[PDB]
Amino acid sequence: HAQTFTAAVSKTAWTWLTSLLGGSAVIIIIGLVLATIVAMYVLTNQKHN
Amino acid sequence: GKRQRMVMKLESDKTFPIMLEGKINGYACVVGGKLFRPMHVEGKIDNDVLAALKTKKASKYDLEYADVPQNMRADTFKYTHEKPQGYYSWHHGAVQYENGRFTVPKGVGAKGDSGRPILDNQGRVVAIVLGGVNEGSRTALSVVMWNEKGVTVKYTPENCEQW
């Protein structure tokens, strides 16, 4: 036969790739959303004076 | 006339200058059990008790703060958030509070008078002078103040010069 790339990768190996490689992106984008919400809240309470 | 005398009588013991090789460049503030002191004014505290402490920093709000001990909390300034528009007392006379902005007439204002608190007709600190910008005939102030919720608001006009 003819070999392929990503031919012997198991569904366990795809799980340990995906849950540790896209989960990092999920953590960094919820860090961005949390920082944006904190910045907007602190600037919103400042508007009164 | 008598307004400067009232400022000198209220700010006699509670106001301590900042020394830097004999030069007076700023003034700290002792209010609410807290010691307010800016970033750009660098030097040694003239008081012996307030100098041997550790001040937590806030570079965005331009303030260093510390904890005054319990044996000195009664001899502090007063503070409030309820403030109407009009006139207020300042060390060089009067200051106008219009549209949420502090304005000082020209002639006064140099490097060294940073940290002087703004008083009212009762004797409560409403703002802390940090910087100033020359606007036509009547300069504007870049100060900090409080509100009803309890958030320290820093007001800063455009192109200010730190004092």
From Swiss-Prot, chain B:
It is found in: Virion; Host cytoplasm; Host cell membrane; Host nucleus. The record marks Y88, N121 as: Involved in dimerization of the capsid protein. Phosphorylated on serine and threonine residues. It comes from Venezuelan equine encephalitis virus (strain TC-83). Signal peptide: none annotated. The lineage of its organism: Viruses, Riboviria, Orthornavirae, Kitrinoviricota, Alsuviricetes. The active site is at H40 (charge relay system), D62 (charge relay system), S114 (charge relay system). Homodimer. Homomultimer. Interacts with host karyopherin KPNA4; this interaction allows the nuclear import of the viral capsid protein. Interacts with spike glycoprotein E2. Interacts with host IRAK1; the interaction leads to inhibition of IRAK1-dependent signaling. Part of a tetrameric complex composed of host CRM1, host importin alpha/beta dimer and the viral capsid; this complex blocks the receptor-mediated transport through the nuclear pore. Interacts with host phosphatase PPP1CA; this interaction dephosphorylates the capsid protein, which increases its ability to bind to the viral genome. The chain holds residues 113 to 275 of 1254 of the full protein. This is Capsid protein. Forms an icosahedral capsid with a T=4 symmetry composed of 240 copies of the capsid protein surrounded by a lipid membrane through which penetrate 80 spikes composed of trimers of E1-E2 heterodimers. The capsid protein binds to the viral RNA genome at a site adjacent to a ribosome binding site for viral genome translation following genome release. Possesses a protease activity that results in its autocatalytic cleavage from the nascent structural protein.
